[PDB]
Each structure stands twice: as structure tokens, then as C-alpha cells.
Amino acid sequence: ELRVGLEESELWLRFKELTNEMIVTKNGRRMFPVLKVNVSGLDPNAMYSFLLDFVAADNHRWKYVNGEWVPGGKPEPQAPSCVYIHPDSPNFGAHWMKAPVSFSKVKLTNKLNGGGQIMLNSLHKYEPRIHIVRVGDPQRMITSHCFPETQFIAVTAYQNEEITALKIKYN
Ligand SMILES: Nc1cccc(OCc2ccccc2)c1
């Protein structure tokens, strides 16, 4: 069976218990923690690309009020479709399965300023999603995988000082 497992799930859960936050900037900011997954059950002989996108979690935005995240208003129109292609793509099943797949270079932004960045709306919640795309396939068969442990709110600045401290502790 195809199995995609989240790496460092206990680390993600430490951030999720606080409500995770990722900084967005004009020029784009890398994530901490980094999304990394282990993969088994691909065809080692076949070629695949790995894609990452971010799914909006809510029909509303969020606000940090008195140390609590609470619903913060109606949402902005959805961010444009942004897909990140894992730079090892395309590659053999054997390549993807031999070591965890790390999305360490993806950049989150709040301005369409190019550079293969992901545009996100500030104070909106997102959930990372990985797609495995088989190459040379007439059926164009693509598997998707959500990681609920990795949900976060996009912010221009950290709201929760416990998140600021965690980011420094573990990074
Ligand atoms: N791509 C793939 C390869 C081998 C087994 C496989 O499991 C069948 C399946 C699992 C989960 C959702 C839908 C279908 C999927």
C-alpha cells in the first residue's frame, strides 16, 4: 500500500497545541518546522513528481485576542492556486522512498513577487497537502495527502509569544 507518514509529528503537535503560526513576507519566508514525509509503497521503478499546496481551512479569518485565537471576520477572497514542485522532481519511486522527502526551500509570501512562492492570506488558517504525480501516465493519476498536524495561521508577525519562543527553542 502507498503510505505517506509525517516526520517529526511530535514537534508539529507542540506547535499545533499553541496554534501554529507561519510568517509571510513580501520576499517569502521558509517554514519552521519544515514539512518532511516518509514514503513507502511507490513503484521503485516508476517516476513521480512531488507537489505541495496549502488548503484554506475556514470560511472566516482569525484574530488573536486576550491570548486566544478567535474567529476574526469574513475571509479575504481565496489566495491564487499556488503549487510548489519538490526540486527532486521528477524522480524514481526508489529516490522518494530511500530517505524522507523535505520541503525545506518552499517560501510563504503575501505578495505575488515571483520566485515559485506560495501566496497566503494573513490571519487565515491553512493545511499543507502533498500530491504524488506519476510521470508518463495517460491516466494522469495523482494521489493527495493532507497533514492535519501541520495546520497553521499565516501571519505578518507572530501573535503568540509562546510561538515566538518555540520557534527559537526548536530552530
Ligand atoms: N496509489 C496507491 C498505490 C497502491 C495502493 C493504494 O491504495 C489504494 C488506495 C488507498 C487510499 C486511497 C485510495 C486508494 C494506492
Swiss-Prot record:
In this entry, the residue ranges of the DNA-binding region are 11-171
Identify the domain of life: Eukaryota
* Compartment(s): Nucleus
Phenotype upon changing residue 131 to R: In SAVA; reduced DNA binding activity; increased cell growth; altered expression of genes involved in ossification and notochord maintenance
Please list the disulfide bridges. none
- Tissue occurrence: Detected in testis, but not in other, normal tissues. Detected in lung tumors (at protein level).
Q: Which residues does UniProt call coiled coil?
A: none
Annotated disorder: Neural tube defects: Congenital malformations of the central nervous system and adjacent structures related to defective neural tube closure during the first trimester of pregnancy. Failure of neural tube closure can occur at any level of the embryonic axis. Common NTD forms include anencephaly, myelomeningocele and spina bifida, which result from the failure of fusion in the cranial and spinal region of the neural tube. NTDs have a multifactorial etiology encompassing both genetic and environmental components. Chordoma: Rare, clinically malignant tumors derived from notochordal remnants. They occur along the length of the spinal axis, predominantly in the sphenooccipital, vertebral and sacrococcygeal regions. They are characterized by slow growth, local destruction of bone, extension into adjacent soft tissues and rarely, distant metastatic spread.
What role does it play?
Involved in the transcriptional regulation of genes required for mesoderm formation and differentiation. Binds to a palindromic T site 5'-TTCACACCTAGGTGTGAA-3' DNA sequence and activates gene transcription when bound to such a site.
Subunit structure of this entry? Monomer.
From the Swiss-Prot or TrEMBL record, give the protein name: T-box transcription factor T
Source organism of this protein record: Homo sapiens (Human)
Q: What is the lineage of its organism?
A: Eukaryota, Metazoa, Chordata, Craniata, Vertebrata
The gene is TBXT
Entire protein: shown range: 41 to 211 of 435
